[PDB]
């Protein structure tokens, strides 16, 4: 256990435990779900609150005209990588005068997070990214990790009790590719209503949805343009 | 006598020791490798075996004989990374000598610079002291051929019958029993004594495909790596 101190120390079983600890710290964020169609990439998160009176901590935040990211974990490192993200977008927007393809941006993010996991004197980033974007080959749903082993998927779900949501993604990943936005979004919250305990229901104010489409600029919605999305449901089979 | 953190860093111990460097003098011994140098007359001979159990592994790129400059060769033991890094540093300081001073570097000055860099790594802590040993050979005018050895500690020396690696207490015992009869060394004598001393150490008496022979002579001062055919020629020439 005395080798279980710092980022630099390898294990005598090879598994550097700081990255495992950062993973488990990412697991204790809010739940979130990101999934794409052939033409529309929708990411759906869930908010929590500190108390009754306070507002909810926001998760789905804007990045650029075709990029919006979800998040889980710490918010300071989140806003730090958000600053870097916006910077890297606007830099190529300045130089090449084109929007960035998503994959090279996520390569830049992984290379950015490579250094603080590699030397001594920095920590890995508690971070929960779900990136949705549009290059010329359409929507992409990427996720990252504090180990920077970023993945491309067709539907991920990270955060608290996200595994049952992944079972839902398994049993409807055939269905996902074909449909339009409405039932896509209600599949998304038909994952999130299983991210919750069954003795309560998903209300308006706690949920947030971000859509980007191949002609649609990335737009965030909260309770007012989500009241149309919350109807069209039945109860859970109690 | 482990006082303070003398098992960990470059500090002085009680009674006068420091363990990090005298742990590095057996950092050569994990190589499983053996090297012999000979200088008796106006030629100078290196010999060192390989150990390749694989058919999938090559044979050309496995050689430890490293042409530093056109007149200076060397051979390495110990672990490979430290050896090759030391090799690039040696080449770099040789080219720097040629640029600054206008003429070819002598093997003496170069080994002294390598030992100085070894001290520089030795001096600060938080720095790993490069567990490889370097033997250099070359011809100098008005002195003939030269043999030098470089320690990890930065203690270089230059001497005739030379051997470092795994088994060289025995090799130096053979060379004390051998370099005492006052015979001359007419270059077949040198090659024959080198191969036979490595043959008395390892007791294998093997093919010409295992040892690499590095030679340099005052007839052609260029460094020269021997070919399979002439190694076989010398081998069957000492086969009686």
């Amino acid at each position: 256990n005395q080798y279980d101190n710092d980022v630099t120390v390898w294990s005598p079983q090879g598994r550097i435990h700081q990255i495992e600890y950062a993973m488990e710290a990412v697991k204790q964020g809010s739940a979130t779900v990101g999934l794409k169609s052939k033409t529309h990439a929708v990411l759906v998160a869930l908010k929590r609150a500190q108390s009754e009176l306070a507002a909810h901590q926001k998760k789905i935040l804007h990045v650029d005209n075709h990029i919006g990211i979800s998040i889980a974990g710490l918010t300071a490192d989140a806003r730090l990588l958000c600053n870097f993200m916006r910077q890297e977008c606007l830099d190529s927007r300045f130089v090449f005068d084109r929007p960035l393809p998503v994959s090279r941006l996520v390569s830049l993010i992984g290379s950015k997070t490579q250094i603080p996991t590699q030397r001594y004197g920095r920590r890995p980033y508690g971070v929960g990214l779900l990136i949705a974007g549009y290059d010329d080959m359409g929507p992409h749903i990427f996720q990252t990790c504090p180990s920077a082993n970023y993945f491309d998927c067709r539907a991920m779900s990270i955060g608290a009790r996200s595994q049952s949501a992944r079972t839902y993604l398994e049993r409807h990943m055939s269905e996902f590719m074909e449909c339009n936005l409405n039932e896509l979004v209600k599949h998304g919250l038909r994952a999130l209503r299983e991210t919750l305990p069954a003795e309560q229901d998903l209300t308006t104010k706690n949920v947030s949805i971000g859509i980007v489409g191949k002609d649609l600029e990335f737009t965030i919605y909260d309770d007012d343009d989500v009241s149309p999305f919350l109807e069209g449901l039945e109860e859970r089979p109690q | 006598s482990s006082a303070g953190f003398d098992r960990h860093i470059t500090i002085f111990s009680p009674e006068g020791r420091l363990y990090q460097v005298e742990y590095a003098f057996k950092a050569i011994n994990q190589g499983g490798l053996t090297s012999v140098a000979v200088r008796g007359k106006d030629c100078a001979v290196i010999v060192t075996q390989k150990k390749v159990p694989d058919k999938l592994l090559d044979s050309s790129t496995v050689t430890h004989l490293f042409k530093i400059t056109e007149n200076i060769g060397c051979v390495m033991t110990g672990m490979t990374a430290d050896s090759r890094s030391q090799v690039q540093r040696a080449r770099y300081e040789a080219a720097n000598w040629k640029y600054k001073y206008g003429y070819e570097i002598p093997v003496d000055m170069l080994c002294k610079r390598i030992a100085d860099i070894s001290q520089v790594y030795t001096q600060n802590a938080e720095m790993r002291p490069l567990g490889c040993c370097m033997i250099l050979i070359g011809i100098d005018e008005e002195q003939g051929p030269q043999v030098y050895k470089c320690d990890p500690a930065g203690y270089y020396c230059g001497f005739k019958a030379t051997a470092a690696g795994v088994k060289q207490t025995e090799s130096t015992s053979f060379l004390e029993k051998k370099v005492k009869k006052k015979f001359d060394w007419t270059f077949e004598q040198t090659v024959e004594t080198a191969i036979t001393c490595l043959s008395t150490v390892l007791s294998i008496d093997f093919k010409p495909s295992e040892i690499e022979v590095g030679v340099v002579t005052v007839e052609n001062p260029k460094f020269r790596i021997l070919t399979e055919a002439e190694i076989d020629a010398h081998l069957v020439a000492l086969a009686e």
Partner: protein, 232 residues
């Protein structure tokens, strides 16, 4: 590197610096040497036994000139010794750049001891296990300066450093005196070195440098075998 920059050498509850005392012990576990200041010259002499019969005595040289008139020997570890030799060389040549005159030995010992003192205090590096014996014939009067790893220095009429240096010192006090010549100093220096060395002592076991007023001189094994072939 990172530049961690802290020194490992801090004070004891006794007030001592145990790394420096260990470095002095590591010096004392080194090769013997003898240096004697006579009435006209100074004699340096070391004791160099090769580990095998394979080593050559033409490559490594203990006795070392710093200028053409300043000899310098040690008792310790050559890898540190060469470093501070080279430092002293560059330092003396900077002096000769500024003043266009040969640097005096006191000035050498000031500057070298300041550098060594700086290594005793600066960050993380070990001190240098070398005890110098610096000398030279500057302005008629010759000098003899011993230094140490602690950065300090002294001035001896005659001294010794290395194995059984106290025994050599006690022989020096009875045998050596204030006024002799360079030859008699060489004689008693070889006597006190041969008091403590091994039995097989030849023209290659020792290495002797003298300091005339004509300058520093490094003797050859030719004249050593002229002299040390049963000097008494």
């Amino acid at each position: 590197e990172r530049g961690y920059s802290f020194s490992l050498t801090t004070f004891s509850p006794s007030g001592k610096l145990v790394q420096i005392e260990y470095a002095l012990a590591a010096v004392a576990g080194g090769a013997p040497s003898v240096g004697i200041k006579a009435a006209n010259g100074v004699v340096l002499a070391t004791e160099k036994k090769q580990k095998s019969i394979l080593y050559d005595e033409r490559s490594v040289h203990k006795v070392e000139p710093i200028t053409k008139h300043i000899g310098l020997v040690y008792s310790g570890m050559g890898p540190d010794y060469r470093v501070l030799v080279h430092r002293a060389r560059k330092l003396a040549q900077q002096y000769y750049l500024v003043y266009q005159e040969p640097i005096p030995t006191a000035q050498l010992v000031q500057r070298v001891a300041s550098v060594m003192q700086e290594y005793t205090q600066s960050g993380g590096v070990r001190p240098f296990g070398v005890s110098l014996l610096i000398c030279g014939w500057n302005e008629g009067r010759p000098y003899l300066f011993q230094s140490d790893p602690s950065g300090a220095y002294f001035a001896w009429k005659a001294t010794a450093m290395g194995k059984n240096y106290v025994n050599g010192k006690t022989f020096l006090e009875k045998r050596y005196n204030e006024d002799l010549e360079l030859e008699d100093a060489i004689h008693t220096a070889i006597l006190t070195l041969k008091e403590s060395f091994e039995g097989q002592m030849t023209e290659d076991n020792i290495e002797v440098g003298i300091c005339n007023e004509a300058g520093f001189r490094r003797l050859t094994p030719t004249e050593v075998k002229d002299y040390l072939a049963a000097i008494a």
